[PDB]
């Protein structure tokens, strides 16, 4: 059933699985109309589909054209997510198809289950983890490809860069979740921490800077400090 702290190691076993986060699929700006009413303008979105073992990110860009002349968009967004994930699974060879898909939001279970009836052996699961994948659009290179898209497009990333050469997927996922948590809690502070030292760059084929093992420990420290500070602010404690 549901995925939690108790069965955390399962993410890093040799059964292919994907996380699906739909929190950036339907995105709007709210503004005043000339008559002083309120209207939304949709902007480009993305499905965040991640293999937590390999770091392979299937970023399906959702172009605003998919909403044209549709009603009940927040409901359609769940079904469109489920359609795109099912299209992605069908496009993979059999031996690459996931044995499980974990949705970060319970509203995705029925839409994905209905779209995957052809795949009765693929388990659709919720999670009790509060994963910060919503912050994916705080990664500059992912944000840039989403906002520049002029049509529907799938872009393939490794969200771990070359980390798996040096650390396990357990540790790579912990680093990713801490970076995203930070970016989600205080984006300005988080991005300042990541780029304050101009000598450390982001390779053209990477998302994050090229930190030595020692520099990651320091970065990881500064991100934990940012999170606890902001927590003592939010809650005055």
């Amino acid at each position: 059933g549901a995925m939690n702290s108790s069965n955390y190691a399962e993410l890093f076993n040799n059964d292919i699985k994907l996380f699906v986060d739909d929190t950036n699929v339907y995105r709007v700006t709210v503004h005043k109309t000339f008559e002083g009413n309120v209207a939304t303008k949709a902007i480009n979105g993305c499905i965040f589909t991640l293999n937590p073992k390999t770091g392979h990110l299937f970023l399906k860009i959702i172009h605003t054209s998919v909403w044209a002349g549709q009603k009940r968009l927040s409901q359609l967004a769940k079904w469109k997510t489920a359609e795109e994930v099912s299209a992605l699974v069908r496009s993979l060879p059999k031996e690459e198809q996931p044995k499980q898909i974990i949705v970060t939001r319970k509203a995705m279970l029925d839409p994905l289950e209905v779209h995957m009836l052809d795949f009765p052996n693929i388990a659709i699961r919720p999670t009790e983890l509060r994963l910060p994948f919503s912050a994916a659009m705080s990664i500059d290179k992912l944000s840039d490809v989403v906002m520049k898209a002029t049509e529907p497009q799938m872009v393939l990333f490794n969200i771990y860069d070359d980390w798996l050469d040096r650390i396990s997927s357990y540790t790579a996922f912990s680093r990713l979740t801490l970076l995203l948590r930070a970016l989600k809690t205080n984006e300005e502070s988080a991005k300042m921490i990541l780029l304050s030292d101009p000598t450390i760059t982001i390779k053209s084929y990477h998302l994050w800077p090229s930190f030595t093992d020692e520099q990651w420990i320091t970065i990881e420290s500064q991100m934990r400090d940012l999170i606890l500070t902001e927590y003592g602010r939010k809650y005055n404690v």
């Binding site: 079904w79 489920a82 029925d110 839409p111 209905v114 052809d118």
Partner: protein, 300 residues
């Protein structure tokens, strides 16, 4: 008016006939039920005084043969049987009547309750849901499982209700996933009505039969079937107007008849709230909504 004679009543038992019920004492000189209205299916049902576990009973139609009850002290139950000798049967029934050892089916002239609960129910359809083709009557009890319950284990003793599953390839057309899941009209009208049931009468007959097995035997799988068949109509944006008007009447008599004390185990809160307040048909069941709100406001 037809008669179901009893050889005897060797064990103390509560006997139901349709919506009526009578206590018979161990070895009480009880020889059966007379004045049974011709033209309807009937159910004769039993709960032993010594084991209120296993309610059980027999669906029959008196037009299809001469039926009697006889206790089997080996299998420990009242069994329905057919008498093929028409003269032996008439002679037996006449003696017991003359000696007034039979209770009279106690129909009030004004009272259409049993007709209203059984309008679409036909013995030939019951015999396809309950398979035992060597008898013209059908045995049901509390513990019998449905074909659908068995998928999720003796097939001979199962209730063969039509399988309804909202998250099934049958229910959902490829490329119409969101449409078919949020509006089940395709599933109701093309798959079930045109495809499997052939008309709304057979659909209502199975719905009514499932309710009565739920109420008279507390058959859990029958209760699930009755709720699924309601929910498939309520969740469809497109239903013939005559089906909605008839569903409102059907459900009205079912809610009116349910023992007040069993609402907690026989009524599914989620399905009813959804059907009366959220569904496409939320404004189409006036009689049902009014009796539910006045009789079971707690459930909602």
């Amino acid at each position: 008016m037809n008669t179901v004679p009893f050889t005897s009543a060797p064990i103390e038992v509560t006997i139901g006939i349709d919506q009526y019920s009578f206590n018979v004492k161990e070895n009480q000189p009880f020889h059966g039920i007379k004045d049974i209205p011709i033209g309807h299916v009937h159910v004769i049902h039993f709960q032993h005084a010594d084991n209120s576990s296993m309610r059980y009973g027999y669906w029959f139609d008196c037009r299809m043969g001469n039926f009697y009850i006889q206790y089997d002290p080996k299998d420990g139950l009242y069994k329905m049987m057919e008498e093929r000798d028409g003269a032996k049967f008439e002679n037996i029934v006449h003696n017991f009547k003359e000696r007034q050892m039979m209770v009279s089916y106690p129909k009030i002239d004004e009272d259409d309750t049993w007709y209203n609960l059984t309008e679409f129910v036909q013995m030939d359809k019951i015999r396809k849901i309950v398979r035992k083709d060597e008898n013209q009557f059908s045995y049901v009890d509390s513990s019998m499982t449905t074909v659908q319950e068995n998928e999720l284990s003796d097939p001979a003793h199962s209730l063969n209700y039509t399988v309804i599953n909202f998250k099934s390839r049958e229910a959902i057309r490829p490329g119409h996933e969101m449409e078919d899941f949020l509006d089940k009209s395709y599933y109701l009208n093309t798959v079930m009505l045109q495809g499997i049931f052939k008309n709304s009468s057979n659909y209502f007959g199975e719905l009514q039969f499932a309710f009565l097995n739920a109420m008279f035997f507390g058959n859990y799988g029958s209760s699930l079937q009755w709720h699924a068949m309601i929910e498939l109509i309520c969740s469809s944006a497109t239903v013939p107007k005559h089906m909605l008007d008839k569903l409102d009447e059907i459900l009205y008599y079912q809610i009116k008849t349910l023992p007040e004390q069993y609402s907690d185990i026989l009524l599914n809160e989620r399905v009813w709230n959804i059907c009366l307040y959220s569904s496409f048909q939320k404004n189409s069941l006036h009689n049902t909504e009014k009796i539910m709100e006045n009789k079971y406001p707690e459930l909602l």
